[PDB]
Ligand binder design. Sequence first.
Ligand SMILES: [Cl-]
Ligand SMILES: [Cl-]
Lengths: 125, 125, 5, 5
Amino acid sequence: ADSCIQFTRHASDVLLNLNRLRSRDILTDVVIVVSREQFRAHKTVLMACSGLFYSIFTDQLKCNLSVINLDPEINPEGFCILLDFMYTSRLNLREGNIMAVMATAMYLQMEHVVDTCRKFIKASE
Amino acid sequence: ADSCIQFTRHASDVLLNLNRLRSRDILTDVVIVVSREQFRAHKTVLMACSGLFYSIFTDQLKCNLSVINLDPEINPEGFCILLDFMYTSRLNLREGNIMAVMATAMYLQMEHVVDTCRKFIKASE
Amino acid sequence: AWVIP
Amino acid sequence: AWVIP
Ligand SMILES: [Cl-]
Ligand SMILES: [Cl-]
């Protein structure tokens, strides 16, 4: 302990460094395939951000797979935007991509992203 | 992107989930040995927090090791406190452990921890 | 939570 | 940074 001190910037610094490892392809251990596109990532980061990836990588057989193929209805740009969000906290939400981002976030089980997509859509109707 | 929105709590939520994976021993890929004690962890988290572990796991031979043995002068409690800090942002700094925490943080190349240890020591002299 | 960074 | 959490 109750006597701990805390470094405010630590969590963001860790995330920034995990994104630098991803950029340089250091210790990436899985390829996510979204139709014709491939995305290299760290399984622990995916599990920490997505209920779907947590379910996949806690499965006794799927935990050992080096390639995961997503449903063909998933938009690769939508997945790219959510993968960037996982590694940076920043979501590039635009009129031209919001429906694909929302559909991808529902599939990946990322409720906070689903919620902001619903709010932006509702504001425009 | 320049049009991104940001989820303030994302980085801390990611770190909290990586610590939950560590607690449950999920996808841990290295054992750090500090004399008689063993600590299971994720190489990417260690690399994101420590200059020493970044150097170790970017080495073309050491990146593949599943066990890393630290210098015998390293105190296991000191290492435990810094490993908890890496996964939570919280540092359990006490009169009885500050010298060991500072020595361990210098070895692990964690400058922000070294800096607060120096400030607490200086305040007591 | 969401903000303009 | 450091704070009392
Ligand atoms: Cl989310
Ligand atoms: Cl530090």
